[PDB]
Amino acid sequence: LPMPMRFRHLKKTSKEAVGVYRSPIHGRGLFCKRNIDAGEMVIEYAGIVIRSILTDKREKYYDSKGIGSSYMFRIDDSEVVDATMHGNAARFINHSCEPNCYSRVINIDGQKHIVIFAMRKIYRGEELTYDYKFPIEDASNKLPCNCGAKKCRKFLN
């Protein structure tokens, strides 16, 4: 299937297949509401697409408002999706060290989208997770991982 076709299908179906709920990992997460088969698109990490150079300015602006989580998702060296103020339920997908989903950039009509795909068959009730792949920071700003995996690396950083 041409990627634009399964991308529209995604947009037409994601709201029915996933939902936001309380999470044992941390606060709110995204949960599977119907079985999702391996390799299927789950949801887009939607937001405001910005040039990479605007990232740092927006980050310090957001810390000047107190937002403690990072809702920015890098597409490539030139662009970033900013979901801090405008975005969808993909905002709430937690990190796991043994995740059941992965992220992937797709090209649609000369525009890039960050899409989350099912790494395996995912069953109703499972919490959806992917590896944030945060760059490794120094131990003054390590964030400890509560993903619960047996192979947990203990921080997101």
């Binding site: 992937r104 945060f134 760059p135």
Partner: peptide, 8 residues
């Protein structure tokens, strides 16, 4: 500058 990524 702390952003999620699809690869390191």
């Amino acid at each position: 500058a702390r952003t999620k990524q699809t690869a390191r």
